[PDB]
Design an enzyme around this catalytic site. Sequence first.
Site, PDB file in Angstrom:
ATOM      1  N   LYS D   1     -12.745 -28.262   2.014  1.00  0.00           N
ATOM      2  CA  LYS D   1     -13.725 -27.241   1.675  1.00  0.00           C
ATOM      3  C   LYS D   1     -13.328 -25.918   2.279  1.00  0.00           C
ATOM      4  O   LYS D   1     -12.235 -25.775   2.814  1.00  0.00           O
ATOM      5  CB  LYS D   1     -15.114 -27.636   2.163  1.00  0.00           C
ATOM      6  CG  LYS D   1     -15.696 -28.864   1.482  1.00  0.00           C
ATOM      7  CD  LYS D   1     -16.203 -28.551   0.083  1.00  0.00           C
ATOM      8  CE  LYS D   1     -16.924 -29.748  -0.526  1.00  0.00           C
ATOM      9  NZ  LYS D   1     -18.157 -30.123   0.209  1.00  0.00           N
ATOM     10  N   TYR D   2     -14.228 -24.946   2.189  1.00  0.00           N
ATOM     11  CA  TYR D   2     -13.973 -23.630   2.757  1.00  0.00           C
ATOM     12  C   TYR D   2     -14.354 -23.589   4.230  1.00  0.00           C
ATOM     13  O   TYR D   2     -13.508 -23.338   5.091  1.00  0.00           O
ATOM     14  CB  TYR D   2     -14.745 -22.566   1.980  1.00  0.00           C
ATOM     15  CG  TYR D   2     -14.665 -21.195   2.576  1.00  0.00           C
ATOM     16  CD1 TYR D   2     -13.541 -20.420   2.406  1.00  0.00           C
ATOM     17  CD2 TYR D   2     -15.725 -20.663   3.285  1.00  0.00           C
ATOM     18  CE1 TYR D   2     -13.464 -19.156   2.941  1.00  0.00           C
ATOM     19  CE2 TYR D   2     -15.655 -19.404   3.828  1.00  0.00           C
ATOM     20  CZ  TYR D   2     -14.523 -18.654   3.652  1.00  0.00           C
ATOM     21  OH  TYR D   2     -14.449 -17.395   4.185  1.00  0.00           O
ATOM     22  N   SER D   3     -15.622 -23.831   4.528  1.00  0.00           N
ATOM     23  CA  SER D   3     -16.109 -23.804   5.903  1.00  0.00           C
ATOM     24  C   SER D   3     -16.139 -25.211   6.495  1.00  0.00           C
ATOM     25  O   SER D   3     -17.171 -25.721   6.920  1.00  0.00           O
ATOM     26  CB  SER D   3     -17.477 -23.143   5.964  1.00  0.00           C
ATOM     27  OG  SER D   3     -17.345 -21.738   5.920  1.00  0.00           O
ATOM     28  N   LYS D 130     -19.578 -29.804   9.089  1.00  0.00           N
ATOM     29  CA  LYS D 130     -18.510 -30.445   8.340  1.00  0.00           C
ATOM     30  C   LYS D 130     -17.169 -30.167   9.002  1.00  0.00           C
ATOM     31  O   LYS D 130     -16.940 -29.094   9.566  1.00  0.00           O
ATOM     32  CB  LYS D 130     -18.478 -29.971   6.891  1.00  0.00           C
ATOM     33  CG  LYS D 130     -19.350 -30.783   5.969  1.00  0.00           C
ATOM     34  CD  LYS D 130     -19.013 -30.494   4.524  1.00  0.00           C
ATOM     35  CE  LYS D 130     -19.254 -29.039   4.199  1.00  0.00           C
ATOM     36  NZ  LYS D 130     -18.817 -28.704   2.828  1.00  0.00           N
TER      37      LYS D 130
END
Lengths: 321, 148, 437, 490
Positions: D1-3, D130
Amino acid sequence: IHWPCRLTIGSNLSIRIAAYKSILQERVKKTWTVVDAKTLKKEDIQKETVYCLNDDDETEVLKEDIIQGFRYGSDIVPFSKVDEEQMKYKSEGKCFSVLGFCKSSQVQRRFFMGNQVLKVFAARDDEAAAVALSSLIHALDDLDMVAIVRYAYDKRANPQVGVAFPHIKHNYECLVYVQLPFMEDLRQYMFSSLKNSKKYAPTEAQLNAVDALIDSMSLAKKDEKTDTLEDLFPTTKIPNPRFQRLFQCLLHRALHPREPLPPIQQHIWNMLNPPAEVTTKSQIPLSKIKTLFPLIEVTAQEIFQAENFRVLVKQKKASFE
Amino acid sequence: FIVCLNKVTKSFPPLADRFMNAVFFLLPKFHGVLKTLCLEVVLCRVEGMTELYFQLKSKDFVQVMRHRDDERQKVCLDIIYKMMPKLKPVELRELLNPVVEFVSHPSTTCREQMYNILMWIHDNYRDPESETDNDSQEIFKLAKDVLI
Amino acid sequence: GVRCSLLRLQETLSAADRCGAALAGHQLIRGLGQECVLSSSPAVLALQTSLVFSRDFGLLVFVRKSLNSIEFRECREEILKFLCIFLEKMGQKIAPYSVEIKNTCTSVYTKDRAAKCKIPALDLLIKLLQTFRSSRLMDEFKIGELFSKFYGELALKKKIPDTVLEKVYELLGLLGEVHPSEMINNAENLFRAFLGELKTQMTSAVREPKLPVLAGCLKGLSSLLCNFTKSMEEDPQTSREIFNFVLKAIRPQIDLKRYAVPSAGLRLFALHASQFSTCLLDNYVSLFEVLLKWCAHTNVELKKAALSALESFLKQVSNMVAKNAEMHKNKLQYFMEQFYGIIRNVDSNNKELSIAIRGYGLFAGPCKVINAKDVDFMYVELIQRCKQMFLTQTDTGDDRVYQMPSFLQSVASVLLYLDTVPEVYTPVLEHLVVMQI
Amino acid sequence: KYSGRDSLIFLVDASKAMFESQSEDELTPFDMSIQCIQSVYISKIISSDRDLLAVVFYGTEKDKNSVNFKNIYVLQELDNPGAKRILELDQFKGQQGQKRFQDMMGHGSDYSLSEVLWVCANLFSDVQFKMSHKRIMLFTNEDNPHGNDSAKASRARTKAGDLRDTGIFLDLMHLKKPGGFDISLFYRDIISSKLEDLLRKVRAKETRKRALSRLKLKLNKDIVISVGIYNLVQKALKPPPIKLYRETNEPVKTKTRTFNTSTGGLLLPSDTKRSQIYGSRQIILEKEETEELKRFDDPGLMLMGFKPLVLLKKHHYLRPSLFVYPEESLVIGSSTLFSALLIKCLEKEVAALCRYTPRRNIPPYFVALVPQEEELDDQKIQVTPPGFQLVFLPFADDKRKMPFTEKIMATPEQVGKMKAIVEKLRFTYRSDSFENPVLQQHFRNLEALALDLMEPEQAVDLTLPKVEAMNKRLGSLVDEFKELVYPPDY
DNA sequence: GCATGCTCTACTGCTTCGATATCG
DNA sequence: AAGCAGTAGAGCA
DNA sequence: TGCTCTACTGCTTCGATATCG
DNA sequence: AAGCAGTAGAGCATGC
């Protein structure tokens, strides 16, 4: 701007030298003063800034009670200025000294970072320094030997390293200067490969169609039996259109002080448009590729804007029966 | 992941056991109906596991037998009616401490489960031999006191 | 059940391992304020008000001893979303505990940084000021400073987001509706702050409009105009501007969703219609078209907020045509032929033609000014129209009992005006109104 | 994912031997591990300051954990790099720190096995974010911790597989007992030594990857595809200050306004005009007109023909180039067309030319799209990804004109000795490493402020050249290069 | 024949970060 | 909000 | 009536500020 | 820009 310095190779080779600036972003030097309605005067308003607190109300503080801090991990570390003024870097005046050289052109187009271009020329005054540096450029031009300069403006400035590539020009050959990225700038990541694509592989019918489109849409042509290319539509001579739009809009409100906004003039769009003979030429292959490729896929002022039938015959009606 | 895993495991038990060490990894992250779905997965394969108790008390079971629902607090007691007859009374006496805050509960099914675990914890901890410690004689002292 | 679930809620505030305690706070408040709602006995409800609103423990010292933190935010949201309902299960028996609720809301607004904990602490204050009405306590809820705070915060605050600039714009008008004795000097400097914003959000050709500020500014103007009327008599330019802005907010628009600009323009119309009456004249065609259009929008609140706008439109133009019925004869004839063309149709709905019948009974009045016999053509046409629809023909095999109100209201509105009642239809008029009884 | 942030558990072996100096007098491996852990926290507190960093010693005498296992003692918890946590960490140095280790927890016990990995697993389970990567970094020397029991070995390789399947990967920085690559033993199954990359090598870096704009490419009439304009050289700068109330060290919540129509009273923004005086008279507008007089185009790239790669002179320059890529998120079937146009532009050496408007109201701007092709080998070297490049182009008033009027030449003899000098100073340029001294000294200033250690660690100035290693490197040709033809001659 | 009760899906706004233009 | 040399008005002679 | 200080000073580059995606 | 999280609105099923 004549920026003066002394290009020293090693510790002994002194070359008195000046550098002039070149291609740079341009803006306009007159911002918008904020006046009041219905009196139309500058001084009629004044701003204030206060720093209160986060209590039940604004138990304020003052200018004599504020230190700057920095984020560090999961807190803010204090000790504002005399600390970070004492423990500062010092640049020792201007610096224009050669760091090294290079031969293999891994210095390339896409790694420049420096939002100006410094054309570093020469000096005046009995040009022993300029004949020395023209020997330097006359030795750098005949090979791929680029130069690398360390440059900084002044003691307040920040230090710089940059490419120096000689020139190609008849009347002069003065050295170019671009800045260069640093180890923290050059982030780079992994963009996917397109060649061994089992899903997105193009058919050679589409390949030659796009080749026909490129052949139909050129912009520079070799003519006149000198066997060199000459360019139609050069995007390096057009004046920038937003200051002309600003110029004529201010002229308009200075003349007719009730009228609304005039829309954009037509010759501006003509100048910012290409000669449409290439559009007429490309009318056919663009329709061709649109057929052969498969199925691709509010402003405020615009959002809110017996005998009865007998007398029916006798007065006037349609036809009879 | 957990939605379809709950669907397959509601009709088939032994496909949990490839993932049983990877539902507990997710369990302190689902603060909703999905936590009820993970516990619905967990109850299929309790009767037959080795220990279960260390992972349950490490994954903060106490503050999740005390949320506000009826389905979550019914499955949270069906697993505890499952894992009675394998625990030692050093830890059953810390399990009987928040399961007798169900004398002042609405929803008669949840109280029925509570007076259904107490009915066994009285009849098979009567100490039919002579004497025991201060835990196997204290769980009877707190289950002879809600059944009155 | 409570006070154990309150002493533990104060026990999970100073203890270590925070964010393991904020979830304990949310668990306790959701179980407290759920039991404290399902309780029908004034004994235990007379206790729980003093337990909840206590001063040692209890739900109002939490939000003053847990406000300079960030972990407890779900808890400080849940308290202010519970007190908006515990002000509704109760009524005006929270009369002593009210300046403390007002102080809680003003400090939770001015000390916090979120915008999901500045919305419920502006639903509580609005519902508070709308329960404790023009009454005694308004000299304790100090309006003369609660205005100056929320009016300074439109200048000395940058980027108040969207759904906080809604409720600020609505609370700046509720203070002019209830308790208008202290807002004499500072309701003149509020029409400018309602008109500048409402211009900018609707005539600016650079951007896209933010609709939850238009909803708030219309719902604020629609309550400042109570008790601070601006008719079209003494200075009829501000009311012209308000009509133009409501008229851009009701144009026959493009297809939309999120109906909250038409359903606030229409309700500013359906109450304060009398201020603008000259300007209501010359747009009668388009106004009638759009209000009949919005009258059946298949949305069970847009119909209810369009029908009253149509009724006030008809009723407020009738008293202008029946004042000077010489030059308004084309208006009278146009409305008459339109109502005729509605009623001659063979259609489905009863609220399709009930508005037509009521409009005809309305305009029965100004026919006396021009003919003094057409009124007598009416009240015989009307009674003959009215009887056999439901008296004799399908006395019990019909579903038509839903327009008899407009029938009897229309019959009364025509029967008021004439002289020399013609004496024969009265033993069917007195079968009619006993059938409606 | 991104973050999705990076995670790292440090796991240290404090059981039997490393607390002792391995009967040496140089450096105990315990001190080696503490120096490496402290340098990793110091690097990631400004390198990647959103990641997760825990530290757990095992084999010690007393124990504290959420599981309540014997002889496993955690020190910190999964959170950001915190200065107070590293000032807790740096107390285990030398003999006095070894005795502080003793009085705090005490070394030496019957150290168990995979239950330490279970405590690592429950430390990873309870996070409420996450996480992209899960790495266990084991700092140890020995080889047989199951030297007697075989069921302990089987249980160790079972629990390691239970960490293998749900995405937790470990590597052990194998502490060399004599100082060499000796133990070629049987933990190549558990794993997927050099510690200099843990010791110094990441003093200034930042982790980010953003798209910067997600636009449309139109072929001037109706034929539209998607493109997204990523960035490569962003000119990073130090983070800006925070105002602070020096009594209690709290920030002060700045609020400003405009007021005072020379009487008293606010001004909400509806009653201010925007003016420009020009000598005598004024010119008044509204805010919406002075924002409207720059509006030319919808946002995107309209194509205006094709030009070869040769006649655009890649020294015309005002802004760093960005980098397009063909997404299939807005339209579908765009990578096919861009790959076809790219291979035809490549095999016909031609480049696109476009008019560019980035945002919803920006004046137009001419750009040149020059193609590039990738390069890949067995070593997976990556200098070029396969896309285009947006060379920005000047319009007309970017270029100044220099006065130009001097032209005097000389004899073609100095070019040979200057060729000798540049071949003396010939080398491969770099791939990295000319780091910014101002930002680096500011980094270490802040390190010494928040840690009060001794002093500013004076950063070495790599930007400066090596004049000692250059002047004697070239030698005694500088006098002849100075005085062949050009001394200044007085 | 009109009013209400209940669910799920797509629209929409907020929060955080990073890049860009502006004003000293 | 800070420095860097460029270009005309003053001080001793 | 003659050559160095001096007031300005235009510019230029960071540094703080505000906007936008 | 990116992720997410919360509510408005429409359609099936029910009642008077």
